[PDB]
Design a protein around this ligand. Structure first.
Ligand SMILES: COc1ccc(C2=NN(C3CCCCCC3)C(=O)[C@@H]3CC=CC[C@H]23)cc1C#CC(N)=O
Ligand SMILES: [Mg+2]
Ligand SMILES: [Zn+2]
Length: 331
């Protein structure tokens, strides 16, 4: 009430002490912040990594842009909302400080990875690309049916810099901006699951040929490799829910299932084929999660864990324990 925080902001601040740890209580932060998890977590991270001084970002501009970006995630969407954005941001933030990547990435690469995490699902309508395509939506027309959502996410994330007092990149040189931008685009476009197999194939190829001079940190000596790692990093963060403590993981599963079932309901009532996993009448959440883990998340994370051996061991362990838990609850 002029000077010091309210009691609610103090509780927020104490939760925010876990910002560098896997399994931050992100839902509690959403509650405590007045549904501003993305704004507060991004601001804490930016401070912690000293990104405001390094890139000469005025603080009011950062807050303004963050609030604006957060306002363009849909509160009526159960999974692909600002809490998910905040979790992928915070998850990418943890992955960036992994010991095997110490001093590997520049401040600009770190910025790109964080900013990309923040915008990666903005303005998500809670239905899939295929749904947008099959309905003939304007978004699908604009993007020629190709990575419709992910293209839209980028375009919105950047467009919003143009609102009043929102250009957080106003003090970067053109050279910094062009490089930031290319990285952010490459990162976000790689979040489309249709790219998953190729991304995973290339990450394996990198783990086969991996080099490691001086300390024990990875050697990445060209753009193609540096960007791959960043892309896989944010892709791991995006696919991190099953690696979190179970209480968190289940909240995410509840939410994704609600969103998917909602789409299935829209699909039914319109007489469309029901998309896989979206039919509330023919669901096994437990089988589905075990298959997601076995076909998608475990192969990716096991490969990530090889790249940065042994830094991801506890994350892989938690994933395997969660997978057993779900396997044991199968009817
Ligand atoms: C915590 O659970 C989940 C969390 C996330 C996802 C995601 N799936 N996919 C696709 C869906 C179609 C099959 C092809 C692979 C995965 C997405 O495109 C989403 C958007 C971006 C990345 C991954 C997202 C699924 C589940 C689940 C499940 C369950 N049926 O139990
Ligand atoms: Mg997405
Ligand atoms: Zn996402």
């Amino acid at each position: 009430r002029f000077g010091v925080k309210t009691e609610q902001e103090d509780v927020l601040a104490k939760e925010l002490e876990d910002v560098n740890k896997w399994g931050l209580h992100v839902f509690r932060i959403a509650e405590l912040s007045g549904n501003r998890p993305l704004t507060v977590i991004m601001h804490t991270i930016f401070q912690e990594r000293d990104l405001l001084k390094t890139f000469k970002i005025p603080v009011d501009t950062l807050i303004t842009y963050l609030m604006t970006l957060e306002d363009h995630y849909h509160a009526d969407v159960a999974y692909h909302n600002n809490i998910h954005a905040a979790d992928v941001v915070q998850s990418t933030h943890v992955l960036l400080s992994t010991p095997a990547l110490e001093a590997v990435f520049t401040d600009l690469e770190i910025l790109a990875a964080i900013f990309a995490s923040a915008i990666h699902d903005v303005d998500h309508p809670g239905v899939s690309n295929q749904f947008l395509i099959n309905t003939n939506s304007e978004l699908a027309l604009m993007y020629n049916d190709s990575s419709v959502l992910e293209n839209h996410h980028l375009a919105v994330g950047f467009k919003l810099l143009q609102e009043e007092n929102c250009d957080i990149f106003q003090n970067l040189t053109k050279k910094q901006r062009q490089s930031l931008r290319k990285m952010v685009i490459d990162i976000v476009l790689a979040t489309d699951m249709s790219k998953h197999m190729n991304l995973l194939a290339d990450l394996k190829t990198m783990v086969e040929t991996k080099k490691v001079t001086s300390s024990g940190v990875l050697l990445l000596d060209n753009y193609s490799d540096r960007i791959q790692v960043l892309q896989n990093m944010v892709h791991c963060a995006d696919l991190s829910n099953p690696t979190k403590p179970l209480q968190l993981y289940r909240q995410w599963t509840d939410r994704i299932m609600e969103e998917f079932f909602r789409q299935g309901d829209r699909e039914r009532e319109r007489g469309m084929e029901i998309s896989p996993m979206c039919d509330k009448h023919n669901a096994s959440v437990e089988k589905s999660q075990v298959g997601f883990i076995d076909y998608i998340v475990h192969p990716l994370w096991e490969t990530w864990a090889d790249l940065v051996h042994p830094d991801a061991q506890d994350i892989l362990d938690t994933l395997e324990d969660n997978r057993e838990w779900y396997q044991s609850t199968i009817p």
